[PDB]
């Protein structure tokens, strides 16, 4: 269960995290983060590149674990283009809601991850024949994870988590009608 998009995303994250270590956070942040200034708004990469930045090794590992587990499943059973689209829609939207929640200084792949969780869960629910599904041990831990960010158990992007979750559920629900 190793598709091209799964691994290309993992490599990107690792490539970006290395650069953050050579140059420091702020330095990469100033270039990849969501536009802080409407003057920068046509720097179109920014709406996606925030997802690549991680600020702790544990975080890049945790996120890439989820991404490889759930991203591999979508790409294996449903195709690479399907994974591309979940990724781009949810990076864009979870970044958008995160910016409104708390402004432009945020990063990480977990908005995309929560949108993969929403997707794989509702898709395997409404649509078993797709061959993907989320275990209830895992949506135990997804549900525990959103709410831990709530209560500040830890400095989480909370717009990001909730925005992606919604994105994933919404897309899985659409897809489980055209199925």
């Amino acid at each position: 269960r190793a598709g091209p998009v799964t691994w290309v995303m993992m490599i990107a994250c690792v490539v970006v995290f290395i650069a953050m270590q050579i140059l420091g956070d702020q330095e990469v942040m100033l270039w990849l983060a969501w536009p802080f200034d409407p003057t920068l708004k046509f720097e179109f990469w920014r709406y996606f590149t925030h997802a690549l930045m991680h600020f702790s090794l544990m975080h890049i590992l945790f996120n890439l674990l989820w991404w490889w587990y759930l991203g591999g499943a979508v790409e294996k059973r449903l195709g690479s283009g399907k994974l591309i689209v979940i990724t781009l829609i949810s990076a864009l939207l979870s970044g958008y809601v995160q910016q409104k929640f708390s402004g432009p200084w945020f990063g990480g792949l977990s908005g995309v991850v929560f949108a993969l969780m929403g997707y794989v869960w509702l898709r395997g629910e409404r649509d078993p024949q797709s061959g993907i599904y989320l275990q209830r041990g895992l949506i135990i831990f997804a549900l525990i994870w959103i709410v831990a960010g709530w209560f500040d158990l830890m400095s989480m992007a909370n717009g990001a988590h909730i925005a992606g979750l919604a994105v994933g559920l919404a897309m899985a629900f659409v897809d489980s009608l055209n199925a």
Partner: peptide, 4 residues
């Protein structure tokens, strides 16, 4: 910052 905040981590997503």
């Amino acid at each position: 910052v905040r981590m997503a």
